[PDB]
Design a protein around this motif. Structure first.
Motif, short mmCIF file in Angstrom:
data_model
loop_
_atom_site.label_atom_id
_atom_site.label_comp_id
_atom_site.label_asym_id
_atom_site.label_seq_id
_atom_site.Cartn_x
_atom_site.Cartn_y
_atom_site.Cartn_z
N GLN A 86 40.49 -5.59 8.99
CA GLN A 86 39.20 -6.06 9.47
C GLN A 86 38.26 -6.40 8.32
O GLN A 86 37.36 -7.24 8.48
N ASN A 87 38.46 -5.79 7.15
CA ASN A 87 37.69 -6.19 5.97
C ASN A 87 38.07 -7.60 5.51
O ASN A 87 37.22 -8.50 5.47
N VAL A 88 39.33 -7.80 5.16
CA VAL A 88 39.80 -9.07 4.62
C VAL A 88 39.98 -10.13 5.70
O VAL A 88 39.98 -9.83 6.89
N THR A 89 40.12 -11.39 5.26
CA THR A 89 40.49 -12.53 6.08
C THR A 89 41.86 -13.02 5.63
O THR A 89 42.46 -12.46 4.71
N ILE A 90 42.37 -14.06 6.32
CA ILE A 90 43.79 -14.42 6.22
C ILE A 90 44.13 -14.93 4.82
O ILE A 90 45.22 -14.65 4.29
#
Length: 44
Positions: free
Chosen positions: A33-37
């Motif tokens: 949920q912190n990072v993006t793809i």
């Protein structure tokens, strides 16, 4: 929704969504949920 739930007495209700451990996805959904793809592919 048609399943009756929290039986008391000598029983505890816990919910395990998948029984088998996955070696592919990490088992902490907040890190995801912190990072993006695009940030999943960041090298060392």
């Amino acid at each position: 929704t048609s399943y009756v739930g929290f039986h008391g007495g000598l029983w505890r209700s816990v919910h395990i969504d998948d029984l088998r451990r996955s070696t592919i996805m990490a088992s902490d959904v907040t890190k995801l949920q912190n990072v993006t793809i695009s940030q999943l592919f960041k090298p060392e």
